[PDB]
Design an enzyme around this catalytic site. Structure first.
Site, PDB file in Angstrom:
ATOM      1  N   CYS A  34      16.213 -73.271  32.816  1.00  0.00           N
ATOM      2  CA  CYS A  34      17.516 -73.364  31.838  1.00  0.00           C
ATOM      3  C   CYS A  34      18.309 -74.645  32.003  1.00  0.00           C
ATOM      4  CB  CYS A  34      18.510 -72.265  32.368  1.00  0.00           C
ATOM      5  SG  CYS A  34      17.729 -70.707  32.572  1.00  0.00           S
ATOM      6  N   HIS A  73      27.542 -72.698  31.086  1.00  0.00           N
ATOM      7  CA  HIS A  73      26.180 -71.980  31.176  1.00  0.00           C
ATOM      8  C   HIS A  73      26.284 -70.622  30.339  1.00  0.00           C
ATOM      9  CE1 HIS A  73      21.982 -71.683  31.928  1.00  0.00           C
ATOM     10  NE2 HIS A  73      22.291 -70.675  32.747  1.00  0.00           N
ATOM     11  N   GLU A  83      29.829 -68.637  37.740  1.00  0.00           N
ATOM     12  CA  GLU A  83      30.162 -69.679  37.162  1.00  0.00           C
ATOM     13  C   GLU A  83      31.812 -69.661  37.170  1.00  0.00           C
ATOM     14  OE1 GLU A  83      28.461 -70.429  33.185  1.00  0.00           O
ATOM     15  OE2 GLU A  83      29.232 -72.459  33.322  1.00  0.00           O
ATOM     16  N   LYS A  91      26.335 -70.073  23.943  1.00  0.00           N
ATOM     17  CA  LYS A  91      25.284 -69.170  23.731  1.00  0.00           C
ATOM     18  C   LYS A  91      25.722 -67.575  23.504  1.00  0.00           C
ATOM     19  CE  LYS A  91      22.894 -71.056  27.986  1.00  0.00           C
ATOM     20  NZ  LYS A  91      23.713 -72.235  28.168  1.00  0.00           N
ATOM     21  N   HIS A 113      20.635 -67.558  24.518  1.00  0.00           N
ATOM     22  CA  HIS A 113      20.031 -68.314  25.557  1.00  0.00           C
ATOM     23  C   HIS A 113      18.772 -69.177  25.165  1.00  0.00           C
ATOM     24  CE1 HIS A 113      19.450 -70.432  29.147  1.00  0.00           C
ATOM     25  NE2 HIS A 113      19.411 -69.641  30.145  1.00  0.00           N
ATOM     26  N   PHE A 172      17.449 -70.847  36.480  1.00  0.00           N
ATOM     27  CA  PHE A 172      16.628 -69.649  37.439  1.00  0.00           C
ATOM     28  C   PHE A 172      15.874 -70.837  38.083  1.00  0.00           C
ATOM     29  CE2 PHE A 172      16.717 -67.032  33.320  1.00  0.00           C
ATOM     30  CZ  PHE A 172      17.702 -66.232  33.930  1.00  0.00           C
TER      31      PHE A 172
END
Lengths: 409, 409
Positions: A162, A301, A312, A333, A338, A397
């Site tokens: 990502c 994110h 986060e 997002k 995503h 990830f």
């Protein structure tokens, strides 16, 4: 060290086949998640996705050329074309050696792999396409973009799940900062809506199984339960500052900071407390020579998973302390889904246009306040605000944490 | 700018399951190409490959852990373990944030993709492994290595086909040079001996169809006719110079230059005349502050294809002029085969040990002198020579040119 500015943007996203349309729709809270059509939803436990709407590769490539590229490369080419055109940069023999390409993809040409392996099994090895290898590998975005525009500087690809696009843009920023290029075509592209991708992310329990596109993706909401898969690409033109001024380039903002760290924790789960994400954000603002209080807006994110949005938030509190409540945060997002390796490129563009328009696009679908995620996520409605310094986060990830800082100029 | 040295090496190659064994065999001209056993040669038009010999992953991982990783990650882990141990570097809470990982793979977990997609087709999407995605993606080398050693600095992966490891090491070098890490675990790993990889490279007409392992791979020979596929990994520990001296680290050499350019020519064919390769070599020596006459030895890309070996010779003549005849060149791919994304890591190690031992490993199988390739390729027999400055070239498919410069210290 050289200063580096953004002189062009280009994107294809689930809420627009160009960057400006995407940003106008983001400011309006447009939802790009809908019933899946790329694959038959009756054949999968996940029924929704954030797809490009009416994207036509033939506006950029002849049919014969497009057949020799995976969808992810279609998106990289389209976005790079729009970004180069937007920038007005002319790449010719006099400067080609000083213009490079750094475009990432997280998973590359998965659809091509599926199609060609089925040919291998059903028809024999001799029937595999001569272009299978180049079409599948994630660096074909950079390879094709370099050829298309004649860019003869560094030609590279970072692959960090990502964080792919955010790392790629940061890496390109560092190329220019150290004097090794005057311009870079950089970002990320991803076409992950494929049957094996869905099967793998579902087996990993990463995707929300909520079939309602109006509530499935809800970053920072108490009821979030996994990410929603999207596709597209986001590309920017980075340019050395004196070079940009000399030609009168339109400048969106300055890129001033890049942070990158690793969790060293687990191959798919992010680390507790946002430990690594916090270090990436702090590294990025330190790189920019700015204290935390200077940050006005965080494009998070914010993938709508239990762990990410919690961790986060905790990382933001760690880095920004008393200022964490004062700045604004949003996850776009919530609208784009995503987009995996493309996300940092699309979101860098949104962060840049937040500066331009002094409007923050909202986190849509944020209806149930969480006790842990209690910061200001600009819920539901866009907000006018004086925005001069922005950061964009990708905590991907595999423990790949990356943050970029942009500042008005 | 910080100075950067190499303090550890680790490798698994077709001529040895550790770096020192591989280098001893390289100096002896040992051929790692043999009849293929990873796949049944009776089922493919290519019958030979350069495989690891008697590699046992259980020396590094428990069986349960190894089952959750592709072969390419096995090789990255084994080589990183040997390199970290060789370096004596201790990674603990006090310095973990300053030790990063930059390991590339060109094609990642192709075997895993083949196996899991067959499960998808034959047994249904529900049977795909929860670890499919992490196992297949090329950044799992960096991800797993970071976790194994607790490295919390930048965690990244460059994917640039045959240049993967050379770019990755250069990118890690630049991280340390700009002050963003004190040490980096860096290199490349590849396990490309799979049925789809063979089918794709054969369809692309890139592989030699010569079934004789004693003559198939012959870089710079008049009768060369394609590359021979290999596997393995090569990892080095890069370290900031003052940090290395402070702990008394053993130092193999200094890394002093990194060049990277793009052909902007074709997605698989290299550019005529070595135009881009020449610019990469010149950029690398310029980065090192050295003139061409200072280079003593070139570990060539030298893949045994008609175009590459010709174009690389032409690029060497362009950069080195009258000195092109005076320096020494060798392709150790004559012995290891073309290990694709791993090649630059293995070959960086060989270049470093050329400095240590003042012995150049030969280009074996060089029997028929070519009129175009008329430089000194150290044919057949190792040569003693005073070697203080070396370069290692990777001019990979997709127009990715990369060169590294190492210098005695």
């Amino acid at each position: 060290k050289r200063r580096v500015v953004v002189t062009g943007i280009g994107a294809v996203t689930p809420i627009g086949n160009d960057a400006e349309t995407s940003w106008e729709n983001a400011k309006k809270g447009v939802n790009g998640v809908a019933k899946m059509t790329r694959l038959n939803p009756d054949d999968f436990p996940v029924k929704i996705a954030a797809e490009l709407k009416d994207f036509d590769v033939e506006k950029y490539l002849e049919k014969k050329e497009a057949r020799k590229m995976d969808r992810f490369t279609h998106y990289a080419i389209a976005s790079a074309e729009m970004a180069v055109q937007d920038s007005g940069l002319v790449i010719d023999d006099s400067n080609a050696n000083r213009v490079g390409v750094w475009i990432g993809s997280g998973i590359g040409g998965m659809e091509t792999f599926e199609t060609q392996y089925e040919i291998f099994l059903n028809r024999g090895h001799r029937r595999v396409s001569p272009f299978f290898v180049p079409m599948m590998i994630p660096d074909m975005g950079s390879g094709q973009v370099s050829i298309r525009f004649g860019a003869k500087g560094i030609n590279s690809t970072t692959v960090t799940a990502c964080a792919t696009a955010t790392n790629s843009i940061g890496d390109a920023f560092k190329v220019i900062e150290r004097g090794d290029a005057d311009a870079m075509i950089t970002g990320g592209a991803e076409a992950p809506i494929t049957k094996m991708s869905l099967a793998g992310f579902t087996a990993n329990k990463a995707l929300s199984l909520n079939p309602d596109p109006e509530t499935a993706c809800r970053p920072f909401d108490k009821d979030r339960d996994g990410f929603i898969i999207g596709e597209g690409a986001g590309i920017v033109i980075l340019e050395e500052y004196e070079h940009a001024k000399a030609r009168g380039a339109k400048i969106y903002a300055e890129i001033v900071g890049y942070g990158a760290t690793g969790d060293a924790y687990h191959i798919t789960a992010p680390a507790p407390n946002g430990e690594g994400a916090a270090r990436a954000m702090k590294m990025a603002i330190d790189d920019a020579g700015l204290t935390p209080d200077k940050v006005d807006y965080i494009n998070a994110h914010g993938t709508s998973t239990p762990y990410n949005d919690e961790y986060e938030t905790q990382a933001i509190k760690t880095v920004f302390g008393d200022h964490a409540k004062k700045l604004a945060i949003s996850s776009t997002k919530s609208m784009t889904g995503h987009t995996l390796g493309a996300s940092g490129g699309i979101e860098a563009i949104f962060a840049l246009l937040t500066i331009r328009d002094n409007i923050i696009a909202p986190t849509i679908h944020l209806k149930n306040q969480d006790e842990v995620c209690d910061l200001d996520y600009v819920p539901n409605e866009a907000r006018e605000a004086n925005v001069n310094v922005v950061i964009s986060n990708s905590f991907g990830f595999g423990g790949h944490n990356a943050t970029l800082v942009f500042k008005r100029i």
